[PDB]
Amino acid sequence: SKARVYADVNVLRPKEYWDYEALTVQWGEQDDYEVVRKVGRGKYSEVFEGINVNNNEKCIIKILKPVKKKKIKREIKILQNLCGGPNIVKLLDIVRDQHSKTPSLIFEYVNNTDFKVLYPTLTDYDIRYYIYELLKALDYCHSQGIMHRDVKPHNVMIDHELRKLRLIDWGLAEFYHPGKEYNVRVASRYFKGPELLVDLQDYDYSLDMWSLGCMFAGMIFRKEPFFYGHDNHDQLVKIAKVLGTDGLNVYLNKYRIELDPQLEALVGRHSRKPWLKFMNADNQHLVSPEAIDFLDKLLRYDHQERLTALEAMTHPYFQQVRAAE
Amino acid sequence: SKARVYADVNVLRPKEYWDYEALTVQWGEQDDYEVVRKVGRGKYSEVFEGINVNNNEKCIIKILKPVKKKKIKREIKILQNLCGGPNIVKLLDIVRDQHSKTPSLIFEYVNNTDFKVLYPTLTDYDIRYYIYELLKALDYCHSQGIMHRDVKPHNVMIDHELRKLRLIDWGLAEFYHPGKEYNVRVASRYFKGPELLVDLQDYDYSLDMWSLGCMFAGMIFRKEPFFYGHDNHDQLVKIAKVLGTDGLNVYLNKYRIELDPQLEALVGRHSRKPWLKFMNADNQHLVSPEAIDFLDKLLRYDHQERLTALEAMTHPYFQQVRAAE
Ligand SMILES: CSc1nc2c(Br)c(Br)c(Br)c(Br)c2[nH]1
Ligand SMILES: CSc1nc2c(Br)c(Br)c(Br)c(Br)c2[nH]1
Incomplete structure (x- = not known):
């Protein structure tokens, strides 16, 4: 087929x-975004409404539960290719917990x-x-x-x-x-x-x-x-x-x-x-x-x-x- | 249905x-267009390639065989509503034989x-x-x-x-x-x-x-x-x-x-x-x-x-x- x-x-x-496996993530500042309240949660992530410390604009912080670097590159690369397209959730930034590598994807609110x-x-x-x-x-x-x-x-x-x-x-x-x-x-x-x-x-x-x-x-x-x-x-x-x-x-x-x-x-x-x-x-x-x-x-x-x-x-x-x- | x-x-x-019956045709000059060669013919009209005497641009002259004024208004009004639309034959002018009322529709070539x-x-x-x-x-x-x-x-x-x-x-x-x-x-x-x-x-x-x-x-x-x-x-x-x-x-x-x-x-x-x-x-x-x-x-x-x-x-x-x- x-x-x-x-x-x-x-x-x-x-x-x-x-070729998403060949993606080299550009991590941002895990700081610019502050969790305000958990608004959701799948078994692959916890989701919280958040604030962009810089501009005060609301945002959605998706903290990923331990994901294989290969799968994250997939989701990320896909989000990047579709960013701008009609009604596709806009990915605004990718960040990570300094101390433990935990990834968080920042999206439009x-x-x-x-x-x-x-x-x-x-x-x-x-x-x-x-x-x-x-x-x-x-x-x-x-x-x-x-x-x-x-x-x-x-x-x-x-x-x-x-x-x-x-x-x-x-x-x-x-x-x-x-x-x-x-x-x-x-x-x-x-x-x-x-x-x-x-x-x-x-x-x-x-x-x-x-x-x-x-x-x-x-x-x-x-x-x-x-x-x-x-x-x-x-x-x-x-x-x-x-x-x-x-x-x-x-x-x-x-x-x-x-x-x-x-x-x-x-x-x-x-x-x-x-x-x-x-x-x-x-x-x-x-x-x-x-x-x-x-x-x-x-x-x-x-x-x-x-x-x-x-x-x-x-x-x-x-x-x-x-x-x- | x-x-x-x-x-x-x-x-x-x-x-x-x-309301096409309520159309008042704006006749042009039966002159601006000269028949160059018959290129077609239905039982409702004879068609000839033509020249626009003014700009020399080619055109298509459709001479209508005796048509009831009501039907001509239909074809004309429809041509006028669709003029400009994708791939719709462009109607450039409506004219008539002075001597006998015979209508000719001038189209794009x-x-x-x-x-x-x-x-x-x-x-x-x-x-x-x-x-x-x-x-x-x-x-x-x-x-x-x-x-x-x-x-x-x-x-x-x-x-x-x-x-x-x-x-x-x-x-x-x-x-x-x-x-x-x-x-x-x-x-x-x-x-x-x-x-x-x-x-x-x-x-x-x-x-x-x-x-x-x-x-x-x-x-x-x-x-x-x-x-x-x-x-x-x-x-x-x-x-x-x-x-x-x-x-x-x-x-x-x-x-x-x-x-x-x-x-x-x-x-x-x-x-x-x-x-x-x-x-x-x-x-x-x-x-x-x-x-x-x-x-x-x-x-x-x-x-x-x-x-x-x-x-x-x-x-x-x-x-x-x-x-x-
Ligand atoms: C199940 S509750 C929830 N709300 C969400 C919003 Br708003 C956005 Br934007 C994104 Br991205 C995700 Br993931 C969301 N999950
Ligand atoms: C059957 S031959 C023929 N060629 C035509 C062209 Br070109 C145009 Br434009 C229009 Br309008 C008509 Br009616 C035509 N009839």
Whole structure:
């Protein structure tokens, strides 16, 4: 498999663009930034709102829990290539604890409103708008040869008042290389594309669209996560129970990929579930023919069938938002 | 039915934008333009290359065969609204024979190469490129609330050397009005969308995409016309024999449209014909998974399922052309 778009970005760019292991970090002053209050935390870092001692501007300090120098160079190089692009979290500085080497990435500040409390307030248009904004981030990084590999609400910071959105956490992000096999233990479970659940290692930008699709199904259907699987195997089961297994079968055959006997019998056989069957009084006003049509073109077993970010932005669903533009 | 996009363009614009009957033509000097040589001719006009006596710049003089003042105002008003837009034939002046009222529309000159001789020379990329260019014309007029209703090679002037393309002949063009029934005797037969063949009068911009789809199938498969039907009825037969009749059935049912018993039994029952079954040594190099995928998304019975012009431009098929941009 090869990405249907932006497949040669890296092959035509200077090696120093993608050769992240060959990055020599320019550490700044661990001082210019003061932690003001812990505002978040993944298992790969603790996050705090912070102040830039110099200009007093707010900032976000991401202190990294012991990371292999090679992975940090990846996240850093990726942040550097995408810095300036639409809705990409701006990396303002890299610093380190003098005494112990602990890295902290300094980013632009985003007065974010956690999704668990923001999404239920979102109007039909709001969702359309924000998803749209997220699509600019995605189409942009994809156009730079980068797979985020970790799309999800948690990684989409949103300032509702300013309507400013930023795709964050490029720690699981990777450069796309035509015909390269990648680890399928990326992205959060509930957003893991089928290809990740069936060890189809030669994936691409499309991985993200599925993630987005999951995030979108969650927002319109008000069901977060949309595919709540306790474990990777069960994750493929929550999917098959929605997309149907015959679709899965076609996917598996097209890419000559087998399934492990155990999971195989666990995913059993399920008929495709109409998207409208997820509709209820609570989300009826967010569901629409276009929302369904857009979502249907996102959640495709075949990563090759999924809408590319650029195509998603032109789907009529986004027409009103584009018109405001 | 209502267009999935640009549906409210006219409803939000000043009435003088679409009220073409209320146009008061500003006739110029029938003199400034001299016919140099007949270069074309439809049944609604004779076309000649011409010279602008003033600046000596070449021009195209379209002398209209007796037209109802109401239709001329339509073509003229439409040409005026779209003048300046991407690849839209530029209307430079409207004049009239003093002695007899015969109208002549003066347009920009295009050193065109008839398609019957140009297309066979076109490379894979050339086709992609030109179709792309045509899509800008289409997405633009559609975004102004106008249905061309007559897309076809004959109406796409092309200067291969300059790679300049213009969508011409807006004589069958009309303003789009949400929920309005239009005459289905528009566009040339071989490019008539199914909706035109089954009297689905509430069509929209999508009509054009089918036309384009036909033109595209002709160019990649080297089969002009692609759907060669001797008459409107037989036109729906050449289609059903390709898209299959069950698809047709779904279309007919969704829009509660019956078929006339006569044609009904004439279209009989046919299975869908894989697009790749139109491939042969002569067009093999122009056919590709993306070309097929793009075409498949154009030739849909359901005008609502067809790619909108804006969506077609973002289809991976056009990726290389967009990259050159
Ligand atoms: C889970 S709470 C949280 N808020 C964040 C903001 Br605002 C930014 Br900007 C960045 Br970078 C990260 Br990482 C964040 N993590
Ligand atoms: C069929 S030959 C022909 N060539 C044309 C050119 Br060049 C232009 Br510009 C326009 Br407007 C029209 Br109508 C044309 N008709």
